[PDB]
């Protein structure tokens, strides 16, 4: 019988990814895994009908059950408001979910030996996480119409003396100026998420800053990461033969173009079908996995007109496998953990054996010289994955 | 020989120092006589002169309008030890760009037999960002606890002050900063860009994120257009080239979908193929160099008597970009022809299958290159020298 998988929050989406999402469940997940599935429909029509309440409920569910897997969704704009006759221009579901969960987003390209890469030496991927700039963040920028002083001041709540910094004296002409800020707590959450990410994947962790220029702003990221590491993670890192190190952003871009890959890169600041995303909350317990791409509207329109499509499902499949692998980790569920690994290997192996969608065939041959016999359409490719998955799991039972 | 005029030359360090002398000996000096202002920016000489030679080199470029620079060591702690330096001298490139100002444009040289990132790129993409000197700093500080951070603009006459709340720290501290740009720096950026797209005959695109920074980036967009509509749109349409603003997201898109051939002004294969040019606001002064370092790892092999294969292309194009600009300022037609002929010979040689190991590895993959697929540093220079002799001979008859 099937693997007992536990509690998973699933979020259905829109357009081409909604189609692929249901194929993934039907052909690759549901035949092998039984889940206590908390399923929320974030399709644009349901978000409109529920006044976006379904989106906030999904976020709350992810908070409670720790594991979310999300399908790409339409973020409305004025054209979408017309297309769907929306009540309002609903905010992005990803923005709403992130604001409720906090955490840092890590992006990871899936590597196939036969698919050309930027750096030829990159055997293992680089997992990049950017300091979340949030949706309630806002820099304060304005036009400087003419000569005068721009100053930035800090007034302590504790009543001690106010501090004034000259930003620039405009002696002739005008220009622009702005102020930015970050709270210690965001930086701490960023450090924790990054340390947990590195511990989970078993790779070393690099933070890059410009603390040679922004000695105080970037110095704070550097210091807070270092303090949290030494005090809470160093021994854990050593236990797994990994490390954490700060790097100047220049030394980083070098170190990486010459490296083999296989590390986590946090910074402050290739086919989209192979890019995964995961929201890692600072608690180390809660994650939300998704494809890094959108709903592939262009393909969806072809699908509506009954034309043949070739949409890459890999990023969407890995959203499931990262979600299930984290669930297996929380529950100490060995069988689910093997399943999630096996499905990742089947996906990669299928491409590496020469069965792939048109985006990948074009990477290999060049778009001008791709032929229909070089690639599989969306449904043929899912069918091939499904057959290779069955073979892989029968081999595992020997 | 061609009478070439005044060129400021800066000698450098390690592997690039050796290639640089080979370029002069085999490719330049046999055909061009220069009133040569040479500054030795080798690390030993900068240490001995207390970095004065670097400041004199910058002044010479300011005076003579054309500089060509070999790559130089930027000291770190290990270099201090290696050379017993008196100080951690600052980067010579920083010092020079601080004195000269201007915009840095980077450009990969394209050889049709060398794989590129986007296989569709057949014409050059030239990326410019503005060099804001050391006086262009942000003002950043630690916020030690709860309190209010405000940014205020006070006009010179005292009226029409505005105070903007940046953030109310309610539960702890953090960091904050202010930054600025003067209209003059943006106008300089815009002029360098418009005049690069003209000097080269390609369309110019500016990209911003003015959807977020509505005011800050709006100012770059508005000033670029203003300077265009009023000072360049005529000469632009005369060369069937255009200017256009685009959001970064869009730009990145259309860029891969295109075959290249544009100047990309940005509001923020092989290194041996990447060129750099600092273009000063004055439209007159230019500093050209390779967009790579001194190639230390190759120099260590050379020091042990081991064969090397170091690509000279970027260093050669520092010379041809410099000499082409010198030719433009002096209306020197023989010089202009020479500089272009050297670029053609360089590209032609590689496209004929004669290349250094880095390019051979791009084609074959590093585990697959065999010795017969490439030439070492000295063989490649000789091949170029021979093809240059032929190219210039045939142009006479
Ligand atoms: N997390 C989310 O929920 C996301 C939401 N979106 C939503 O997605 C919708 C469309 O956004 P769009 O701008 O089209 O960006 P998409 O990423 O959805 O698609 C962009 C293009 O990238 C290529 N591409 C992306 N994913 C794949 C894939 N899996 N297989 C093959 N090719 C792929 C296609 O290029 P080609 O055209 O060359 O085939 C596709 O047209 C919008 O409504 C947007 O709001 C977008 C961002 C993220
Ligand atoms: N403008 C300047 O003066 C510059 C100064 N530097 C200085 O250069 C020194 C070394 O810098 P480094 O970090 O080694 O970076 P480099 O750019 O000097 O060399 C880095 C690597 O890139 C490849 N490479 C670079 N140029 C060539 C070339 N012309 N032909 C073939 N391969 C090339 C080699 O890779 P492989 O090892 O794979 O063969 C080389 O080891 C430092 O002292 C630094 O300060 C660095 C940048 C700019």
Residue numbers in the entry:
A (entry chain B): 3 to 271, 286 to 414
B (entry chain A): 4 to 271, 286 to 414
Copy text verbatim from the article accompanying this structure deposition.
While R132Q:NADP(H) showed no major global structural alterations upon alignment with previously solved structures of WT:NADP(H)13 and R132H:NADP(H)30, local shifts were observed. Unsurprisingly, NADP(H)-bound R132Q had the typical open, inactive conformation seen in WT and R132H, with a larger active site cleft and smaller back cleft relative to the quaternary complexes. These distances in the binary R132Q structure more closely resembled binary WT than R132H, supportive of a more closed, catalytically competent ground state for R132Q. In particular, the clasp domain and helices proximal to the substrate and cofactor binding site were shifted, with the α1, α2, α4, α5, and α11 helices adjusted upwards and inwards in R132Q versus WT and R132H, resulting in a similar shift of the NADP(H) molecule itself in dimer-based alignments. Importantly, this inward shifting of the α1 helix is a feature of closed, catalytically competent IDH1 conformations. R132Q also contained longer, more intact β strands in the clasp domain, which plays a major role in maintaining the dimer, compared to WT and R132H. IDH1 R132Q also maintained an extensive hydrogen bonding network enveloping the NADP(H) molecule; this network was far less robust in R132H. Together, dynamic and static structural data suggested that the IDH1 R132Q active site pocket and surrounding features have greater rigidity and more defined structural features typical of fully-substrate-bound forms of IDH1, suggesting a more catalytically primed state for R132Q:NADP(H) compared to R132H:NADP(H). We now believe that the more activated, quaternary-like state of the binary R132Q:NADP(H) complex helped drive inhibitor resistance. Instead, our alignments showed residues 111-121 in the inhibitor binding pocket, which form a loop between the β4 and β5 strands, likely had a larger role in the loss of affinity towards inhibitors for R132Q.
